[model samples]
Target: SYKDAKPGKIDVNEFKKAIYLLIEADDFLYKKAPKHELNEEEAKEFCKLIIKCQEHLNKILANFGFEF
Candidate 1:
């Protein structure tokens, strides 16, 4: 088990926590309409909303405006 781990790396617990956090982000972002439940036009709405939110969040969350 530990053989796969590098000399300097997150141990088992840290690895599990990181995985959980990734899944949490996925679940949070995907909580909206499922793909099969929405039509093409409906998907455009979600896409627009996602991009809008991403833009705002990115601007404040990180560089975003910092293209350099």
Candidate 2:
């Protein structure tokens, strides 16, 4: 039998920090990169962070019995 695993809990403060970091990184890349500059690495890292935050939020929502 498979049991439904409980959703994970995240610290609100940590979540806030993660959001800020993600935003700051985005802004930095946008302002610092040249028009033709390739920022694939930085962009990928930022995307990963954003996904992590989203996943954490989804977990929190699921814990409350809510579906996206």
Total clashes in model 2, counting residue pairs 3 or more apart in sequence or in different chains: 0
The local distance difference test score of model 2 is 0.63
lDDT of every predicted structure (CA atoms): 0.46, 0.63
Predicted structure with the largest TM-score when compared to the true one: 2
- 1-68, model 1: which lDDT tens digit per residue? 32443333224544455445445445434665365465687666656655554554333323222331
How well does candidate 1 score on lDDT at residue 39? Answer: 64
* Model 1: how far residue 23 lies from native, Å: 21
Provide TM-scores for the models.
0.38, 0.46
Single out the weakest 10-residue window by summed lDDT for candidate 2.
Answer: 1-10
Clashes of each: 0, 0
